[PDB]
């Protein structure tokens, strides 16, 4: 009877999920609200995480302690990094990673600032397991959960559903050259602000995880933020969760 | 039962001195996060090894809130200097901490390249809700009485100055001196590290008094490389500080 945990950061990313729940009970602890109910008769907890890595990790940890979920779906909006993708396309996270983690080598003031020399700082994703250090350069989406979403692609009617790499950072990048550099360096499909942080906590608790993100925008094609994409993503995720539940 | 003081450090070298000071210990690990529960001066204290970076700090802090319901949080450890006035061994008491790594930029076309001086602090990363209502934060103030106590104890620290300052938290280790200088000039940072504002965010959400206490382990402004002994010195000061709080309980 362990629930599916479904996450979104902002109100617009969870209200459709919350409306789908039957026999809802609301719980707020600290800054974080949860709605506990059922989908297709099976326990589901919807979590509004608030925004960014710290909020995502807090909200995920709190859900682990309170609800002991059997799997986590983290979803919401993202900005395009891959020029092949457009607003409305959905990325299923084959992996996510902390794209905002940076270490740089020593340079004197005279040499100025060059972000192209910065390195991904992997210690930010390092964990312990039974007390022993375990390195991580990314967090893989549970590959069966990833495959299921890809297999359901034709059920989403507002864009393509594709596998891709989710770059998580406390960032909203609109310098197109920076987006291009991040894509060329890390092969990112899209950027957002929670996935790898929630994924880190799910790895620590050994709970299967998948990130599902709709492109709400992409500056690679002059496509500005469309809030309706967040609703469409939740509709797909409800369908996805119901399919999982049909198999439980 | 008395609510414990929670004391945090990210790495082994930042907690082993704290752990050795506790009496009647037990050690609890959940997920990736270890806690040592014991007493200092007969009062309950929990020492937390948070692991490194903002996500880990927030998870470790949240888990401690749920398991232990602490009465206050001291987040401590090492940091890299941003203020040229400061040297390795100096301790910064966090008048405020903030998410220095949070970046938002206005639209620029590819031909204009990349310009980090145009990346502005992205405050939504510190926004919270209080009883369901959105509350903006551009930083988290250290509890001002906790901050004041640490400053009042400055001359009990045997290995450097104790100064108030702004702690810049990011998933970063900056060694481009021009970048350090820019961050200092833009945000008035004393030092940079990787946990404080994230732990502070969680403490604010739970309305638990918080203070960040950081020793400079290094600063590229003075060619001072990392010295692990600073972490031990910081823990010694924090033990003295915690015992003073306990004397008042
Ligand atoms: N471009 C973008 N960057 C970061 N977070 C986002 N959420 C939606 N679009 C985003
Ligand atoms: N310069 C530095 N930057 C980030 N974290 C640190 N921890 C110790 N020194 C540091």
């Amino acid at each position: 009877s362990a629930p599916i945990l479904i996450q979104g950061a902002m109100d617009v990313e969870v209200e459709t999920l919350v409306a789908a729940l039957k026999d809802k009970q609301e719980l707020t602890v600290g800054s974080w609200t949860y709605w506990q109910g059922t989908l297709s008769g099976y326990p589901v907890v919807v979590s509004r995480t608030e925004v960014g890595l710290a909020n995502a990790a807090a909200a995920t940890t709190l859900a682990m302690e309170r609800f002991q979920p059997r799997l986590v779906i983290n979803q919401g909006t993202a900005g395009g990094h891959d020029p092949a993708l457009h607003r409305g396309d959905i990325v299923i996270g084959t992996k996510s990673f902390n794209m905002g983690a940076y270490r740089s080598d020593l340079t004197p003031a005279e040499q100025g600032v060059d972000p192209s020399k910065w390195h991904n700082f992997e210690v930010t994703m390092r964990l312990r397991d039974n007390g022993k250090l375990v390195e991580h350069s990314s967090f893989a989406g549970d590959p069966e959960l990833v495959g299921r979403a890809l297999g359901m692609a034709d059920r989403y009617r507002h864009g393509r559903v594709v596998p891709g790499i989710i770059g998580t950072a406390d960032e909203w990048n609109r310098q197109v050259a920076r987006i291009n550099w991040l894509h060329q360096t890390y092969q990112t499909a899209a950027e957002e602000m929670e996935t790898s942080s929630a994924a880190l906590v799910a790895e620590a608790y050994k709970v299967p995880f998948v990130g599902i993100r709709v492109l709400s925008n992409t500056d690679l094609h002059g496509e500005e933020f469309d809030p309706q994409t967040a609703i469409h993503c939740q509709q797909f995720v409800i369908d996805y969760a119901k399919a999982l539940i049909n198999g439980f």
Side-chain angles (χ1 to χ4, degrees), chain A residues 187-199:
Chain A
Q187 299 76 49
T188 38
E191 66 170 45
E192 45 69 74
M193 307 177 66
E194 295 85 30
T195 299
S196 78
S197 176

Side-chain angles (χ1 to χ4, degrees), chain A residues 4 16 81 119 135 142 177 205 215 222 231 239 241:
Chain A
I4 296 175
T16 300
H81 272 206
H119 314 285
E135 308 280 1
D142 178 284
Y205 279 91
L215 275 66
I231 291 177
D239 189 22

Side-chain angles (χ1 to χ4, degrees), chain A residues 10 15 27 35 38 55 102 106 109 119 124 158 168 171 175 177 187 191 205 212 223 226 246-247:
Chain A
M10 303 175 295
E15 283 180 358
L27 171 70
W35 298 262
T38 61
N55 271 316
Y102 309 121
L106 180 67
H119 314 285
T124 63
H158 300 288
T168 299
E171 302 178 3
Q175 300 182 350
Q187 299 76 49
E191 66 170 45
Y205 279 91
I212 301 179
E223 292 162 1
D226 173 14
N246 174 79

Side-chain angles (χ1 to χ4, degrees), chain A residues 155-171:
Chain A
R155 302 173 65 81
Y156 178 64
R157 304 314 310 168
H158 300 288
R160 301 160 57 214
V161 178
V162 301
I165 296 162
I166 294 173
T168 299
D170 279 331
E171 302 178 3

Side-chain angles (χ1 to χ4, degrees), chain A residues 108-210:
Chain A
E110 198 64 34
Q111 280 189 38
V113 179
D114 189 350
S116 70
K117 298 308 213 311
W118 301 350
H119 314 285
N120 189 245
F121 198 13
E122 297 178 16
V123 74
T124 63
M125 296 173 283
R126 190 177 71 187
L127 294 169
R128 280 188 203 261
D129 184 13
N130 290 125
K132 177 176 189 177
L133 289 169
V134 181
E135 308 280 1
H136 300 280
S137 56
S138 66
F139 298 101
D142 178 284
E144 195 191 280
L145 293 185
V146 167
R148 284 176 178 265
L150 299 174
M152 296 183 69
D154 283 344
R155 302 173 65 81
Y156 178 64
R157 304 314 310 168
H158 300 288
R160 301 160 57 214
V161 178
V162 301
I165 296 162
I166 294 173
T168 299
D170 279 331
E171 302 178 3
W172 192 310
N173 291 285
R174 304 199 69 189
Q175 300 182 350
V176 170
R178 179 62 169 172
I179 297 169
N180 289 341
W181 187 90
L182 290 166
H183 174 67
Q184 290 157 16
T185 302
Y186 297 122
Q187 299 76 49
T188 38
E191 66 170 45
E192 45 69 74
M193 307 177 66
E194 295 85 30
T195 299
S196 78
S197 176
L200 178 150
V201 177
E203 175 59 34
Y205 279 91
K206 293 292 181 286
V207 174
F209 179 97
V210 65

